Amino acid sequence: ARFSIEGKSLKLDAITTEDEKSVFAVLLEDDSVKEIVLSGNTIGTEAARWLSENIASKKDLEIAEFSDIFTGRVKDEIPEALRLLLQALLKCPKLHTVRLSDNAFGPTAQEPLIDFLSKHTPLEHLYLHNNGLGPQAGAKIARALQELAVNKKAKNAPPLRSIICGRNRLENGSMKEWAKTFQSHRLLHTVKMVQNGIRPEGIEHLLLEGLAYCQELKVLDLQDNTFTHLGSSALAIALKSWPNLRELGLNDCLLSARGAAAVVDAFSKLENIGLQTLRLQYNEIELDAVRTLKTVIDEKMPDLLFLELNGNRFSEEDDVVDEIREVFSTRGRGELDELDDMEE
Amino acid sequence: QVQFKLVLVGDGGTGKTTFVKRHLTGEFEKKYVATLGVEVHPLVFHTNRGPIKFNVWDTAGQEKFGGLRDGYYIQAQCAIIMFDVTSRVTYKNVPNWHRDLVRVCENIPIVLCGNKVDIKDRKVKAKSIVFHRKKNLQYYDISAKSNYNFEKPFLWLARKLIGDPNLEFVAMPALAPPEVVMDPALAAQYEHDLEVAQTTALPDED
């Protein structure tokens, strides 16, 4: 029930010849398909048209892997093509996971996104990563998801569970709105908004007025966004909101010596920490904090399997390191990363 | 009239277009508008060895590196890889750009640009940058915003391509502005906009 042309690097312009159509034979004959993967090809509008017609029919569709499918297409043709495909997907009752990452979108192609995302109630896992949405469009996509929230409650449909939206420069421009998108979907499990130029004020909001309402949250990654003391304090306060937190990715966030200081302190106070993987790279975290983070990991973080401090402000030599590595050894389960790049 | 095909590549939202834009309008496009596919913008410069034209092939930073990109790379003669000094993630990707690039071009001048050096909280500092040492690239901190070094990249490649260590930009023949007559309907409603201007305050950043 799986159809795929992954990596076939096809310059799919039309799909009309005897061949070309043969490629999508498995698509035409089998109507009981669950996953369609198109990644690794360039779909022109014409071919997009032919694939739209042949996708609506696949009513048992559950996954649409549309990541990387336009490499080479200009503004002149992506929006149309995207529109047609998303038009079809909309007609799939069981489609819970759709992936549109690695495609040049931004404002110039927000239409299909804004449409589709607000309507497709069956959606549970959204993969909108590296699309260059931008603060402007990012916001519309965010509102569009708020809508979906509503249209979902109207049809008693499953809650949205995963939003993987990074490398889109959502910036602070769209944090006001995204924070609302979260207030909407308080049942998310995986939210990853990595590398969106979101600065301090941005994260403070996104946190305290956004994610903080997702009590169900399991995995949160805000990698490569400027946090600083402001962001950290937010993060500290908010930690108590995610009990079932298991993965916390803060690599490259400039938490600041003072910030990490508090975040660590924050965990110190948490109870029944089921955390399983903490990424704290490049945050200028100083030794005194790493010192405390250790004892905390030891006493209160029994399930930690991964740690990452590479890149901060404390010598790869310093006692604490070995003490940490030692903690996982005694346990038989644990793993610190390689500190081959400390700051200063 | 010499023409050079320069490939501008790099992670999205770094500055490729902003940079190129400024270089042909002087404007600092502050709005982030994703470049679908590839836009070919030509820039001409005048040197002590005549005028040269760079055909900047501005590319899209989402497109996964691979053969599907070959078109841009083919017959290029130089290139600029760009990354955001405030995005560690963006720098970590330089390697992939410089590879998917040297796979079809092999040996060609390439300048690595860490843009937005103007931003306060910087992540990829001047020191740490090494990649250029290990792959024979020229490197420049730049800021499409403050213009810091904004012209070094072209200046370099030009010297490298032309083969004149001491090549330099010079003047630019200022031709005679055309006639300038008329007046009737070809005016009047101009004062209307001239005022819509003298009213709208100038973005003072100095």
Binding site: - | N136, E151, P177, V180, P203
Partner: protein, 146 residues
């Protein structure tokens, strides 16, 4: 690398580049930032055009006087139009270190275009030293026309 080495792609002879600014005069010369006005964006914004030395030139042979600006480093022309009778500097609402004005045809991009500019100087008195010279230069032109 220290200094990446590449064997030249072309061989280009040294050359003497003229400025077509030889039959000049150069009444005024002062550096300033020049701005362009929105255009067909429906969003009335001021887009930077260039930062460099502004110059007022009259023609020895004829009389014609024009404005000619070049950007720093790049030296590309960011303004190059004639001064007509119906033209003048009008303060930019707030601030006096800047003036706006219309040009039926600029030639910065070597293509005749209707530009609605605005230039700003370091000190407000420099703006006067400019407007003064710009006005008594606009005068030298109205006097011209019959």
């Amino acid at each position: 690398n220290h200094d990446p080495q590449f064997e030249p792609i072309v061989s280009l002879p040294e050359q003497e580049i003229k400025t077509l600014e030889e039959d000049e005069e150069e009444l005024f010369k002062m550096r300033a930032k020049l701005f362009r006005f929105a255009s067909e964006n429906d969003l009335p914004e001021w887009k930077e055009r260039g930062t460099g030395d502004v110059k007022l030139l009259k023609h020895k042979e004829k009389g014609a006087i024009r404005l000619l600006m070049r950007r720093d480093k790049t030296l590309k022309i960011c303004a190059n139009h004639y001064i007509t009778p119906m033209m003048e500097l009008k303060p930019n609402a707030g601030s006096d270190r800047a003036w706006v004005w219309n040009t039926h045809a600029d030639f910065a991009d070597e293509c005749p275009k209707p530009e609605l500019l605005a230039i700003r100087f370091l000190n407000a008195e420099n703006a006067q030293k400019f407007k003064t010279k710009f006005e008594e230069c606009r005068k030298e032109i109205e006097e011209r026309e019959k």
